Amino acid sequence: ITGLVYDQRMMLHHNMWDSHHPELPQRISRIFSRHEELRLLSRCHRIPARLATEEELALCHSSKHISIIKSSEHMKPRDLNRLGDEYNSIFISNESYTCALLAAGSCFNSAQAILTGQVRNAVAIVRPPGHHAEKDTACGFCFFNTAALTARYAQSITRESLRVLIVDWDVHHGNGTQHIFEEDDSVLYISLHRYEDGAFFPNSEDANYDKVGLGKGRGYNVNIPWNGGKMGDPEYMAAFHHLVMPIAREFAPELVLVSAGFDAARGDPLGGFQVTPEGYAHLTHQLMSLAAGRVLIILEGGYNLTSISESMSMCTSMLLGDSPPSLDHLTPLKTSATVSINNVLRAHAPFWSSLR
Ligand SMILES: O=C(NO)C1=CCCCC1
Ligand SMILES: [Cl-]
Ligand SMILES: [Cl-]
Numbered sequence: 001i002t003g004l005v006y007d008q009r010m011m012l013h014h015n016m017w018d019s020h021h022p023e024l025p026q027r028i029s030r031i032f033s034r035h036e037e038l039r040l041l042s043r044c045h046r047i048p049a050r051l052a053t054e055e056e057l058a059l060c061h062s063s064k065h066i067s068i069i070k071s072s073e074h075m076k077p078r079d080l081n082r083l084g085d086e087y088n089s090i091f092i093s094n095e096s097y098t099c100a101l102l103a104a105g106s107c108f109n110s111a112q113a114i115l116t117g118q119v120r121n122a123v124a125i126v127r128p129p130g131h132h133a134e135k136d137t138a139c140g141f142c143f144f145n146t147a148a149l150t151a152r153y154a155q156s157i158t159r160e161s162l163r164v165l166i167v168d169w170d171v172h173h174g175n176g177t178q179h180i181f182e183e184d185d186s187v188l189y190i191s192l193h194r195y196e197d198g199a200f201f202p203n204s205e206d207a208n209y210d211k212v213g214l215g216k217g218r219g220y221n222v223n224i225p226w227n228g229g230k231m232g233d234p235e236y237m238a239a240f241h242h243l244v245m246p247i248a249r250e251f252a253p254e255l256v257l258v259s260a261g262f263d264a265a266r267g268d269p270l271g272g273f274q275v276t277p278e279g280y281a282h283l284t285h286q287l288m289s290l291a292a293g294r295v296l297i298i299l300e301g302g303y304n305l306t307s308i309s310e311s312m313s314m315c316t317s318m319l320l321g322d323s324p325p326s327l328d329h330l331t332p333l334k335t336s337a338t339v340s341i342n343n344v345l346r347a348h349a350p351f352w353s354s355l356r
């Protein structure tokens with residue numbers, strides 16, 4: 001059984017000064033509609049959304065940050081525009097807090113359904129996104145770090161050291177996720193992202209391949225940064241073959257979370273990349289070989305409504321057991337992508353014998 005969570009209430013978060021801002025309410029309704037239209041929805045078991053509790057938010061976030069976002073629910077626009085402008089790349093409406101709570105709670109219910117064996121895997125069609133949110137601040141369209149919270153929630157209902165792999169294939173580095181788990185060996189964070197030598201959002205060298213984790217977490221943070229190329233299926237398949245899958249198998253996760261942004265997709269207005277829907281299907285199908293198939297796909301970014309709808313629907317088709325669609329002939333890797341992969345291999349072979 002494949003679970004699916006979607007709740008139209010998450011559309012209520014909106015940009016009251018720029019109704020065309022790309023992080024649109026209809027991102028989630030469009031993905032849901034495509035699942036209906038392809039007859040995937042009836043093949044899934046519907047999992048309800050719920051609000052995350054403040055106690056759950058505290059698994060990853062500071063009391064100050066929770067308080068400030070909570071207070072926004074009853075702010076007038078003046079307080080809201082001003083507050084949002086204090087963060088890097090955030091807009092806020094009175095419904096934003098509730099929607100961020102529903103995104104997180106939806107994922108908690110989904111992880112619970114997987115970990116109790118009610119479903120084998122699941123897909124969470126949620127917004128606002130999470131992976132840029134830090135312990136103490138909002139960033140990059142994200143209020144609370146849904147994926148990071150879901151990992152800690154999973155631990156809280158199983159055992160504290162449950163091995164959680166987070167694969168973040170959003171085109172942007174999940175700075176918040178990296179930081180939250182940087183000193184933690186129970187949550188392996190693997191991100192692929194457009195980097196451009198630190199020029200691409202979120203504009204930090206924290207996203208480079210040499211950031212392998214800190215303290216107990218050394219080895220448990222894997223950054224795969226792309227430079228100087230319009231990357232696509234060949235580069236992502238190669239990164240999975242040489243890095244993601246060998247490391248993941250060696251870690252032997254008990255739960256896999258995908259920070260599944262679809263902004264590396266062909267057609268995205270921001271990412272500049274060309275991963276296809278069939279590419280995302282293949283990535284999903286590979287991850288299903290881990291953790292006895294216990295995979296939760298969590299929407300992050302992705303801004304071409306058609307691209308994200310087709311791409312996420314193909315992921316759910318894989319979770320349901322459909323056979324992978326055929327990739328196009330894979331061109332030789334862009335030269336810089338080979339360099340990137342080899343840089344990560346050299347950084348991580350000390351920690352992961354499967355890379356040697
Ligand atoms: O998709 C994203 N993050 O995943 C973005 C964050 C802010 C800049 C624009 C896109
Ligand atoms: Cl960007
Ligand atoms: Cl120790």
Ligand SMILES: [K+]
Nearest residue numbers: 168170172192
């Ligand atoms: K990423």
Ligand SMILES: [K+]
Nearest residue numbers: 181184187220
């Ligand atoms: K980590």
Ligand SMILES: [Zn+2]
Nearest residue numbers: 170172263301
């Ligand atoms: Zn993104």
